[PDB]
Amino acid sequence: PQITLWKRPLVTIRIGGQLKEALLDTGADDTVLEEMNLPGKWKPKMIGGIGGFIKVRQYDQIPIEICGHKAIGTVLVGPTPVNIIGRNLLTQIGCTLNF
Amino acid sequence: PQITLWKRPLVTIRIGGQLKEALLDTGADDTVLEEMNLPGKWKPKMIGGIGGFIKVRQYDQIPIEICGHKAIGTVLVGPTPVNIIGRNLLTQIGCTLNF
Numbered sequence: 001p002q003i004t005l006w007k008r009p010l011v012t013i014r015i016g017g018q019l020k021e022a023l024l025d026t027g028a029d030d031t032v033l034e035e036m037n038l039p040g041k042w043k044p045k046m047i048g049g050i051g052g053f054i055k056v057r058q059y060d061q062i063p064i065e066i067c068g069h070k071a072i073g074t075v076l077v078g079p080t081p082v083n084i085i086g087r088n089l090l091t092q093i094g095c096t097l098n099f
Numbered sequence: 100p101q102i103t104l105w106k107r108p109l110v111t112i113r114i115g116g117q118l119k120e121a122l123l124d125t126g127a128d129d130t131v132l133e134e135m136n137l138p139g140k141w142k143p144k145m146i147g148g149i150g151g152f153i154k155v156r157q158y159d160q161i162p163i164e165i166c167g168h169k170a171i172g173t174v175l176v177g178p179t180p181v182n183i184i185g186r187n188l189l190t191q192i193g194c195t196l197n198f
């Protein structure tokens with residue numbers, strides 16, 4: 001599909017058995033999801049943007065479906081204000097920018 | 100062009116007559132540039148990101164050439180980690196996401 005940018009590019013994702021709305025975010029290196037109690041091992045990480053850094057939990061090889069396209073990779077979980085799909089998964093679903 | 104996402108979508112922009120590198124950032128509503136001088140009046144504003152809020156200078160109706168495409172719109176100037184081109188200008192240059 002083609003998604004214009006008049007509004008926030010929010011799509012439905014499926015992860016850890018939950019459906020959520022998330023931003024398709026070309027500005028994000030990594031994928032960052034709102035706090036959720038995922039099972040498995042994780043590693044601490046800090047990620048930074050406007051305002052400063054937040055503490056997140058890094059989970060690897062997590063299956064995630066984005067707008068009906070399957071992907072699997074690293075997901076960062078913590079107190080982000082919005083669910084963010086980053087380039088690590090955008091590449092997996094063949095997402096490009098076009099103008 | 101069509102831009103894939105294995106690397107950061109960095110492009111050259113021209114603004115206030117000077118060249119800079121900036122990130123095409125679909126997760127950003129607004130365009131935020133690192134501290135710089137721009138001509139004309141500005142308004143004090145605040146803007147949010149993943150780590151909290153920052154103070155910015157809002158410049159309206161500013162021309163900016165982004166990877167060879169003209170836009171004229173609002174530019175926020177402040178302590179962003181990276182120059183980011185947000186949706187307000189991505190729409191002007193006809194940018195969409197495709198997968």
Ligand SMILES: CC[C@H](C)CN(C[C@@H](O)[C@H](Cc1ccccc1)NC(=O)OCCNC(=O)C(Cl)Cl)S(=O)(=O)c1ccc(OC)cc1
Nearest residue numbers: 025027028029030047048049050126127128129147148149
């Ligand atoms: C300063 C941008 C920075 C280079 C990347 N950011 C991704 C942006 O697209 C960010 C997404 C976001 C949107 C809304 C709330 C929180 C994060 N957007 C952003 O910072 O917009 C800045 C101006 N704000 C606005 O336009 C509105 Cl949406 Cl508040 S991010 O969320 O901080 C981020 C995401 C992933 C990541 O992995 C390393 C590291 C940082």
